[PDB]
């Protein structure tokens, strides 16, 4: 599914463009009217539509944390369907934004904008996966709170950002419908490095593939350590915002373990990161099951919450080392 994965890298950067666009443009920045739900519902639809456009029959296999439905200020329930032309999308968004024409024409231009983001490494890869066995968990913009606050001035504690826009991630995971094993995953940090003078944000994309014993993943920059959420309350540890980011810390090797005790993460939070951690010999396990190892499945519903928490590990040896102490 390299051709599918290659296409998922594009829409992830297209999703990042929308995420960056809303914050960086005054009309969309200044924004009853729940903008974030709109920003989420829009990004997940753009991914859903673009993949159905390039691979017919994937549209109905793409699941996410948002619906394709928004309730405007009047109480009118609008089915978020974009295109086919740019004009149609402006008429749709104006029905949501009470007839804000400047904001509607702003989003539409970024949504229909072409992006040609292509890894030369993955062009060399020719892997075929049957499309009939694929299911996709999308998280449009993970760390919704941090995205809205928009802190560009946070100093990281030993490589790990406790808060800020660095914690915001676009998560796209692909899994096996029958076995429930994660196969492919894309993570896009829209906000990584901001130039102080031009105020522009540069992002960073990561991916991984684990299909029938073939394991490949994006080139990782160089340079136990445990990461937990800011609301964590169970017994060298770091606080860090965002589910997807804390998972990316394990992938980058900034942290050795990421443990979450509560049941308030779902399939769309973990799936993307899992597939990548799988491609590096690691993975994710049910915490409560380990305390009494098994991997997380993404095909059956408990509904779609990872009940009994999780542990995200890079090395199964480091997992045993950590599980020994506790
Ligand atoms: Gd989200
Ligand atoms: Gd999330």
Author numbering: 1 to 31, 46 to 237, 263 to 274, 284 to 340, 349 to 358, 366 to 389
Can you quote the paper on this entry?
Inositol polyphosphate 1-phosphatase (INPP1) is a prototype member of metal-dependent/lithium-inhibited phosphomonoesterase protein family defined by a conserved three-dimensional core structure. Enzymes within this family function in distinct pathways including inositide signaling, gluconeogenesis, and sulfur assimilation. INPP1 catalyzes the metal-dependent hydrolysis of the phosphomonoester bond from the 1 position phosphate of Ins(1,4)P2 or Ins(1,3,4)P3 to yield inositol 4-phosphate and inositol 3,4-bisphosphate, respectively. Conserved secondary structural elements comprise juxtaposed metal binding pockets and define a shared sequence pattern of D54…E79E80…D153PID156S157T158…D317 as shown for INPP1.
We therefore tested the effect lithium addition in the presence of substrate. INPP1 was co-crystallized in the presence of 10X molar excess of Ins(1,3,4)P3 and 2 mM Gd3+, but also 200 mM Li+. In the presence of substrate, no electron density peak was observed for Gd3+ at metal site GD3 with little change in density observed at metal site GD1. A 15.4σ difference density peak was found for metal site GD1, with no detectable peak for metal site GD3 indicating lithium displaces metal at site GD3 and that binding requires the presence of substrate. Interestingly, a 4.9σ difference density peak was found for gadolinium binding at GD2, the equivalent of MG2, indicating poorly ordered Gd3+ in that site. This provides further evidence Li+ does not displace metals at either sites GD1 or GD2. In dramatic contrast, co-crystallization of INPP1 with Gd3+, I(1,3,4)P3 and Li+ resulted in a stunning complete loss of electron density at metal site GD3 (no observable density even at below 1 sigma) with little change in density at site GD1 (remained above 20 sigma). Because we did not observe significant changes in the side-chain geometry for residues that coordinate the metal binding sites, we infer the parsimonious explanation is lithium replaces gadolinium at metal site 3. A partially ordered Gd3+ was found in metal site GD2 in the substrate-bound, lithium-treated structure and importantly excludes this metal site as the lithium-binding site. In the Gd3+/Ins(1,3,4)P3 and Gd3+/Li+/Ins(1,3,4)P3 structures, the ion could either be a phosphate from the Ins(1,3,4)P3 substrate molecule or a sulfate from the Gd2(SO4)3 in the crystallization solutions.
